[PDB]
Design a protein around this ligand. Sequence first.
Ligand SMILES: Nc1ncnc2c1ncn2[C@@H]1O[C@H](COP(=O)(O)OP(=O)(O)OP(=O)(O)OP(=O)(O)OC[C@H]2O[C@@H](n3cnc4c(N)ncnc43)[C@H](O)[C@@H]2O)[C@@H](O)[C@H]1O
Ligand SMILES: Nc1ncnc2c1ncn2[C@@H]1O[C@H](COP(=O)(O)OP(=O)(O)OP(=O)(O)OP(=O)(O)OC[C@H]2O[C@@H](n3cnc4c(N)ncnc43)[C@H](O)[C@@H]2O)[C@@H](O)[C@H]1O
Ligand SMILES: Nc1ncnc2c1ncn2[C@@H]1O[C@H](COP(=O)(O)OP(=O)(O)OP(=O)(O)OP(=O)(O)OC[C@H]2O[C@@H](n3cnc4c(N)ncnc43)[C@H](O)[C@@H]2O)[C@@H](O)[C@H]1O
Ligand SMILES: Nc1ncnc2c1ncn2[C@@H]1O[C@H](COP(=O)(O)OP(=O)(O)OP(=O)(O)OP(=O)(O)OC[C@H]2O[C@@H](n3cnc4c(N)ncnc43)[C@H](O)[C@@H]2O)[C@@H](O)[C@H]1O
Ligand SMILES: [Cl-]
Ligand SMILES: [Cl-]
Ligand SMILES: [Cl-]
Ligand SMILES: [Cl-]
Ligand SMILES: [Mg+2]
Ligand SMILES: [Mg+2]
Ligand SMILES: [Mg+2]
Ligand SMILES: [Mg+2]
Lengths: 277, 277, 277, 277
Amino acid sequence: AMNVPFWTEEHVRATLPERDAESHKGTYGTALLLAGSDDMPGAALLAGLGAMRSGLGKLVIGTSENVIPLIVPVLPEATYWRDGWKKAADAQLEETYRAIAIGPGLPQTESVQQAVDHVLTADCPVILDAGALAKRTYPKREGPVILTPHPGEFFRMTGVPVNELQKKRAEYAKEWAAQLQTVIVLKGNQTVIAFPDGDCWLNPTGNGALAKGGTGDTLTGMILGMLCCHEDPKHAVLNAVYLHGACAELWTDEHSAHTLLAHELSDILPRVWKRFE
Amino acid sequence: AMNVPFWTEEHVRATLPERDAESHKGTYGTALLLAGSDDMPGAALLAGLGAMRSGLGKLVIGTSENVIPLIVPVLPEATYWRDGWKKAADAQLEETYRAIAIGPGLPQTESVQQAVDHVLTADCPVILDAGALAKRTYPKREGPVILTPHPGEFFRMTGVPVNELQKKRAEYAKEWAAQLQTVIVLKGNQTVIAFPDGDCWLNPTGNGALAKGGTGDTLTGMILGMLCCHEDPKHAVLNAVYLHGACAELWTDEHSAHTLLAHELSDILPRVWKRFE
Amino acid sequence: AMNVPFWTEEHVRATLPERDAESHKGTYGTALLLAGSDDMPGAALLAGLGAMRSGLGKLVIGTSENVIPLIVPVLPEATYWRDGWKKAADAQLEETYRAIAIGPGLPQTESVQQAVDHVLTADCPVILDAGALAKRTYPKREGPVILTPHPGEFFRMTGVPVNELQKKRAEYAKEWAAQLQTVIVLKGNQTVIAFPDGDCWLNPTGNGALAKGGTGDTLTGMILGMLCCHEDPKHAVLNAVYLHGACAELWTDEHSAHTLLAHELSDILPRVWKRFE
Amino acid sequence: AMNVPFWTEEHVRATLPERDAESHKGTYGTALLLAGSDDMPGAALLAGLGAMRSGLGKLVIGTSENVIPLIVPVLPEATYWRDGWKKAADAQLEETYRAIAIGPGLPQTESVQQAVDHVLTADCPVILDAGALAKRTYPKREGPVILTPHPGEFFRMTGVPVNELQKKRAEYAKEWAAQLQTVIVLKGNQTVIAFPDGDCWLNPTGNGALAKGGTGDTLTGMILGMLCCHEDPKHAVLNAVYLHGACAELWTDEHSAHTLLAHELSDILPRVWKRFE
Ligand SMILES: Nc1ncnc2c1ncn2[C@@H]1O[C@H](COP(=O)(O)OP(=O)(O)OP(=O)(O)OP(=O)(O)OC[C@H]2O[C@@H](n3cnc4c(N)ncnc43)[C@H](O)[C@@H]2O)[C@@H](O)[C@H]1O
Ligand SMILES: Nc1ncnc2c1ncn2[C@@H]1O[C@H](COP(=O)(O)OP(=O)(O)OP(=O)(O)OP(=O)(O)OC[C@H]2O[C@@H](n3cnc4c(N)ncnc43)[C@H](O)[C@@H]2O)[C@@H](O)[C@H]1O
Ligand SMILES: Nc1ncnc2c1ncn2[C@@H]1O[C@H](COP(=O)(O)OP(=O)(O)OP(=O)(O)OP(=O)(O)OC[C@H]2O[C@@H](n3cnc4c(N)ncnc43)[C@H](O)[C@@H]2O)[C@@H](O)[C@H]1O
Ligand SMILES: Nc1ncnc2c1ncn2[C@@H]1O[C@H](COP(=O)(O)OP(=O)(O)OP(=O)(O)OP(=O)(O)OC[C@H]2O[C@@H](n3cnc4c(N)ncnc43)[C@H](O)[C@@H]2O)[C@@H](O)[C@H]1O
Ligand SMILES: [Cl-]
Ligand SMILES: [Cl-]
Ligand SMILES: [Cl-]
Ligand SMILES: [Cl-]
Ligand SMILES: [Mg+2]
Ligand SMILES: [Mg+2]
Ligand SMILES: [Mg+2]
Ligand SMILES: [Mg+2]
């Protein structure tokens, strides 16, 4: 390795925020989630649940109109911007959000990139995932840009083939976080969290129960919510990745690692988070 | 303070109603919930669940047609008045209800105010929340009118800015309950329950887990149901606010306060209510 | 009273059927449930769940087309006869069913009565509930006809006002079961189960948690399923009514009687039924 | 008998795969499920849940367009091929899958057979169930073909009447697995798993709780998922059938065998599978 340190339980315990008696939901902010399309609807539910579970005050889901009815019965606490991810291709966000995520369940299209460009003119942290991940550069702005690639997405972004990436994961994550001036959460066993200021950590939690469709959609939502309740966005990303993996570890105490469904990570998070308080 | 007393556990225990062996659902009344729009559907599910959980006999949900399918799989016990909140703008209620709530998930429009005006000609308690909260006066009628503003809604109603309101919450709640001749449930930590006869209490339960979208929608439903099973509507409002907060406190025994979803308050209420019996 | 005996735990234990190792789902029959309309959809979900929980082999739900999508995510084990309750107004059932129920969530219309007339030409037990309950007579047929009126429905059927009915419930139930030559399950505390052969029992289970919308829809489904797995339809009706009430009693051990939702009765039935085996 | 051996717990324990720390979801493959039609939608949800529960990496559900919204809220981890089972009638699969299942909730039509013919040109294991089961032969190909008939389906396939089949189940299953050169999972108590190479086993698990609509749909999904995580497809089929039955046995420890709903088998599988690890 390059001796990248693990973000450990001690670090998590020291950095997780309080929800004090005097707070109101405004204290914890409104998040925007731009996710889910008619063709890939479930991602929006997975990210929505992860976000509302993770300490935000309010969530607006800008999903395709036909996806909205699929979310409501499961997550009636979310509100909507009808066809929001499409509308965001055409104009600047008018509303102020605490944090924004774009990409889960979105196609890898130019229109999604147009939406990204408009999202990036906001002054808040922004997460790009999935369909929003492309080979491109980023404008100087206020607020971190957080990319959350699977190794195959990292290849799409950089041209580094997966078989080579996997030999030197932190080295590549660090190099590209620096070059792009973005946070890179390079997924996998020992997920790398590389920051554009050159800080970098490894995540010590998780297991093979996570190697199934949807678990990254859940993670994007987790990061989104934690960006709303942490003052330091670096700590939000680190804690989200950590607690996401910790949920999978709790699952495998009494359940087979073959059998986890992503949404259950959100259902487990309430008890797992308590343990670190 | 003004030494406003807390509505304590002792008061709750002394005032919660029995559901005796000889009762039928008619004993507990039919409630009407005018809530949920295509743009804000989840509020109707949240309030519906809170209402059916809270001791009513039957619930009619007057929600937008497209919202009905989103409620049914979760709350198949509810019945419907298709587009009821819209229809209520145009004519008097023909049916007799035990209690009525209007506003969760409704827009802040003149048409919603027209619906309010028609709701107020019924002889039963009425709850106004959310979109139904405006700067206006109320007609002399039979049955209490119960307003449930968040501080921002209170500002909309009165012109008292939130930063000033928060310095003297009970004083302002009492003054405006008197002026409007309505019950005011002024939300927040230490929620104020101010009555138009000058009685006023503070609620001692709850915590920051409640500072998230949807929890007030759940509360409106709780108050609606409790108005159906309490003979004294004052006690219904007080017990609803109390038990709502108590559910959040049970949650935080083994779950992080960051992670509560409003609908879970309704799922917790069955066991919490038992404890006070 | 008239000293009508209670159908006791001892009777239930002696009459509940086995599900032996050598059985196949055909042994337990296909039930037809004609229930749910666009205006009252939830009844079909409630009765569907109660029926599939109660020992049948297969369930066909003949509900309105727009109701089908509301059932599937909750009860994916059911199959459908699209617009079946409407189609049944126009022709004889072609398929053979083990048992049929009609009425939950159906309007009190002539077309529903036409459907009833066609249902009654089948040779199997038939349950009429809700919208299918009217002032009418019944044709001599093979298989019992089981009416499940609430006292208000009994008034509609017979002209006996509810305040008079309630003074002499068994006497009236027996008289009308005899006159109509139908089973009458006259609902309420101490539900009466009156048979056209003059046998009559009282149900000893249940409590005020049941005095809420939907619980009778659940019961109709329970009776439907139990008619499929009991050889003796009398025992099916008696056991269904008993175990339905027993579920409410289990609920109130740790939950307030004000807070039960009907569908939960079906969720409780698996464990309650085990106790009587 | 013919002394066909039971696939025992010892065999299951020796053959169930690990999900190691270094794995990614690609290791576990993408499955295709061609299931569910407007008329029989629930089968697709049941098989989808069983498949995602059973160790695959990703699931694509090729179901009718109107069925997709019914799956998403329950199984947001699945992705879709809109009208896939219909489209498969018209062209070869372009995408590579680890395993494919076709038939649950599909009609017994020529178009479904056309889809089968195209599925069979893939090089992967394929499961045919329900509507995909017909009297026909199979082309020489790479990858096993796995037929999962109920006795009535076996009759449809072979002309052997059910009353005769049931007297000599293994003998008939073996003879027809050989003749067709397919795996035959002949369902029932003591389900027969007959292989075209002449190997044959009996399944020792399960009980009458399984004799209800939907449980076979769940099984098809289980086999589909296990084909993705086992290197040996024979062991996948055997373990799926075994663990499916084991879930029903866990259910009946504290719940009546009359009351199981198929989807619950998938909910039980996580804990049951752990026990065999
Ligand atoms: N060579 C290639 N191989 C594969 N894909 C390629 C590719 N080349 C291009 N691609 C592609 O890149 C994309 C891969 O995404 P997909 O693999 O298609 O992702 P998905 O099913 O949509 O799931 P999701 O997005 O929820 O999970 P994620 O991986 O984010 O999140 C997974 C989560 O689980 C965690 N996780 C997984 N395995 C783990 C383990 N063993 N230990 C600990 N954590 C683990 C991860 O760290 C993370 O948090 C596709 O567009 C695609 O076609
Ligand atoms: N300056 C301003 N700030 C904010 N909004 C402004 C504003 N000016 C105008 N507004 C506005 O006023 C409205 C505020 O509503 P929103 O804040 O938009 O409400 P919501 O997300 O729709 O949630 P809900 O209605 O379910 O929760 P509620 O607060 O009723 O219910 C919350 C429940 O949780 C309880 N709760 C919250 N925090 C608690 C705590 N710390 N302790 C105990 N209980 C707590 C409350 O008492 C209550 O029961 C908006 O229309 C709006 O734009
Ligand atoms: N004077 C009048 N009063 C009322 N309605 C009148 C009326 N005159 C005419 N009507 C009418 O008659 C109908 C009454 O039905 P509704 O009262 O409208 O029934 P629902 O909300 O649709 O619920 P459901 O059908 O699921 O419950 P049910 O009562 O079957 O099932 C309830 C279940 O709970 C049980 N239950 C209820 N209370 C119980 C208790 N205290 N103890 C034990 N069990 C109890 C019952 O035995 C039964 O199993 C309406 O059409 C109507 O307008
Ligand atoms: N004479 C005839 N009798 C019946 N049908 C006939 C027939 N002639 C033709 N048919 C027909 O054949 C088909 C029978 O299917 P259906 O019986 O209509 O099946 P389904 O309701 O759609 O349920 P599913 O498909 O989920 O359950 P399956 O049986 O696969 O899966 C059931 C699962 O439960 C297990 N199981 C059942 N009973 C068990 C027991 N007692 N012990 C252990 N396991 C048991 C099975 O092994 C299996 O895993 C129909 O098309 C049909 O019309
Ligand atoms: Cl708040
Ligand atoms: Cl009642
Ligand atoms: Cl069967
Ligand atoms: Cl992965
Ligand atoms: Mg991803
Ligand atoms: Mg509110
Ligand atoms: Mg009824
Ligand atoms: Mg089948």
